C-alpha cells in the first residue's frame, strides 16, 4: 500500500485535517493554566458510567518524563501511539546529547509526529490534540504548550481544548489575567476547578486534577482532595 489517504482539496485545505479537528471537538475537555511556579492541567473524566474500575485504569494525564506531562482530547485509542513515541524520544535525548529533554524540544517532536501522518502516503492524520506542559531542568519557568492535529504547535499563557472549550475560554479571558497568574498553588487549582464546573457539572467526581511543581514532582490529587476544594468554591459562589 502506498496509495494516498490524503487527497488535496481545492479549498486550500486537506479534508482529513478538517475531519481530524472535528474529532477533537467531540473529545473530553482539558484546561491548562500555568501559575508562577506550577502548572495545572484539569481534565474531565466521564465517570458517569457506574461500576467502573478507576484504580487500574490510567488517568487522562500521562507522564512522559519525570517533569513533562501530556494531557489529550480526541480519539483515546489513537493517543496511545503518540505517548509510546514520545517516551521513546525522551530517553534518546539523554543517550546521545545527555540531560533530560526540554519542554520545547519534546513539543516540537510531537509536532513533527502528528505532521508526518498528514504528509505521508498510506496513513491518515491522528485526530488528537495534546496539551504538553512541564518544566525545563535547571529551570523553574512553567512552560505550557499546545500541539494540535494540524501538526502546528503553539505556546499559550492558558488554553483549553475538547468539548465546549469556547465556553471555558471566554471564562478564562475574564478570570485569569495575562499579567498576573494566581501565585499560590492552591488558588491556581481552585481557579481551574471553578472553570471545570461550567461544562463538567454533575457533582465532583468527574473532575480530576494533576499538579506539577518543578524539581520533577508530578502528583495527582485524589477525589477526596478535590471534594474539599470544590465545596469551598461552592460555598463562596
Amino acid at each position: 500500500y502506498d496509495r494516498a489517504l490524503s487527497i488535496f482539496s481545492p479549498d486550500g485545505h486537506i479534508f482529513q485535517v478538517e475531519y481530524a479537528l472535528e474529532a477533537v471537538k467531540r473529545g473530553t475537555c482539558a484546561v491548562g493554566v500555568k501559575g508562577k511556579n506550577c502548572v495545572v492541567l484539569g481534565c474531565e473524566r466521564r465517570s458517569t458510567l457506574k461500576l467502573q474500575d478507576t484504580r487500574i485504569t490510567p488517568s487522562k494525564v500521562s507522564k512522559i518524563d519525570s517533569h513533562v506531562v501530556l494531557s489529550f482530547s480526541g480519539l483515546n485509542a489513537d493517543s496511545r501511539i503518540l505517548i509510546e513515541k514520545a517516551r521513546v524520544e525522551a530517553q534518546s535525548h539523554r543517550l546521545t546529547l545527555e540531560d533530560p529533554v526540554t519542554v520545547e524540544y519534546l513539543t516540537r517532536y510531537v509536532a513533527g509526529v502528528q505532521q508526518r501522518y498528514t504528509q505521508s502516503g498510506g496513513v491518515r492524520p491522528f485526530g488528537v490534540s495534546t496539551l504538553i506542559a512541564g518544566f525545563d531542568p535547571r529551570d523553574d519557568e512553567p512552560k505550557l504548550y499546545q500541539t494540535e492535529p494540524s501538526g502546528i504547535y503553539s505556546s499559550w499563557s492558558a488554553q483549553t481544548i475538547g468539548r465546549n472549550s469556547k465556553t471555558v475560554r471566554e471564562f478564562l479571558e475574564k478570570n485569569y489575567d495575562r499579567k498576573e497568574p494566581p501565585a499560590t498553588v492552591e488558588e491556581c487549582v481552585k481557579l481551574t476547578v471553578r472553570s471545570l464546573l461550567e461544562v463538567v457539572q454533575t457533582g465532583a467526581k468527574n473532575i480530576e486534577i494533576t499538579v506539577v511543581k518543578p524539581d520533577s514532582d508530578i502528583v495527582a490529587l485524589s477525589s477526596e482532595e478535590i471534594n474539599q476544594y470544590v465545596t469551598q468554591i461552592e460555598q463562596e459562589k
Binding site: 500500500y1 496509495r3 489517504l5 482529513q16 475531519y19 481530524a20 479537528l21 472535528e22 474529532a23 477533537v24 471537538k25 467531540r26 457506574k50 461500576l51 467502573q52 474500575d53 478507576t54 484504580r55 487500574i56 485504569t57 480526541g74 483515546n76 485509542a77 489513537d78 496511545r80 501511539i81 509510546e84 501522518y117 498510506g122 496513513v123 491518515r124 485526530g127
Partner: protein, 244 residues
C-alpha cells in the same frame, strides 16, 4: 486500474469517525453474550454460546473461552477467525515477557499490547479491523484481580461488572442493581447465571449452552487455580441456583 477500485475505508467521515469500527461494534451484538462479574475472592466468566444444535458437539468446544497463560484467560465474542490470530499473538507476547524478565506478565501490560495491535489496523494500511471483544479475567499480585474489556478500536477500560456481545445495555442495568462490592464466588456464580437467564436470546438457558469458567483463591498458599469446568460440573451448579 488499482487506485480506481481502492476502497479507501480508513479515512475519516465528516464526523471525524471511523464507519468500519462502528460496523464492527454493530456485528458483535449478533454474536453471543459474555459477561464478567468480579467478586472479591475470584472472577466469574460466563459466556453464552452463539451456536447450539443437538447434533453439535459442544463438549470439547472452548469456543469462547481461551487460556492466554495460566493466570489470564479471555472470553471472546465476535468473528472467531480474526480472534484466533490474536490469541496466538498474545501467547507469543506472554512467553516473550517471561523469557526476558523471568517473571509472569501483569494484567495491565498484556491488555495494553493487544489493544495497540488493533489500533494499527484502523489507523492505516487500508485494512478492515479485527472485530473481536475480549473480557480478560486475570490475577497478578500488584493490583490483585483485574477485569477488563477491549473493543475493536483498541481502547480499554477496567470494570467491576461488564457485559459484551448481545444486549449490552440490558445486562448493564441488571448488574448495577444486584452487585455488591464484596461477594463470595458462589454468589457471583449465581448472579452470572441469573443475568444470562434474563438476557438469553432463546427462552431456555442450559449448561450445554453455557461455557463457564472461574479463577479461584481456593488454591492454598496464595496461588490461583484457573478452572475451565466440564459441562457436567456446570449442570450441578445450575440446579443449585435453581434455574433448572
Amino acid at each position: 486500474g488499482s487506485r480506481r477500485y481502492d476502497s479507501r475505508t480508513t479515512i475519516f467521515s465528516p464526523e471525524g469517525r471511523l464507519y468500519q469500527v462502528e460496523y464492527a461494534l454493530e456485528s458483535i451484538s449478533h454474536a453471543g453474550t459474555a459477561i464478567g462479574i468480579m467478586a472479591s475472592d475470584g472472577i466469574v466468566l460466563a459466556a453464552e454460546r452463539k451456536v447450539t444444535s443437538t447434533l453439535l458437539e459442544q463438549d470439547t468446544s472452548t469456543e469462547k473461552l481461551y487460556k492466554l497463560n495460566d493466570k489470564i484467560a479471555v472470553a471472546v465474542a465476535g468473528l472467531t477467525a480474526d480472534a484466533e490470530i490474536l490469541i496466538n499473538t498474545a501467547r507469543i507476547h506472554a512467553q516473550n515477557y517471561l523469557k526476558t524478565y523471568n517473571e509472569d506478565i501483569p494484567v495491565e501490560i498484556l491488555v495494553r499490547r493487544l489493544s495497540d495491535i488493533k489500533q494499527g489496523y484502523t489507523q492505516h494500511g487500508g485494512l478492515r479491523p479485527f472485530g473481536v471483544s475480549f473480557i480478560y479475567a486475570g490475577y497478578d499480585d500488584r493490583y490483585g484481580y483485574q477485569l477488563y474489556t477491549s473493543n475493536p478500536s483498541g481502547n480499554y477500560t477496567g470494570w467491576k461488572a461488564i457485559s459484551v456481545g448481545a444486549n449490552t445495555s440490558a445486562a448493564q442495568t441488571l448488574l448495577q442493581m444486584d452487585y455488591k462490592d464484596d461477594m463470595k464466588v458462589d454468589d457471583a456464580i449465581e448472579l452470572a447465571l441469573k443475568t444470562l437467564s434474563k438476557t438469553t436470546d432463546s427462552s431456555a438457558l442450559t449448561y450445554d449452552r453455557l461455557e463457564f469458567a472461574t479463577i479461584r483463591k481456593g488454591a492454598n498458599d496464595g496461588e490461583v487455580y484457573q478452572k475451565i469446568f466440564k459441562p457436567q460440573e456446570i449442570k450441578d451448579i445450575l440446579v443449585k441456583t435453581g434455574i433448572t
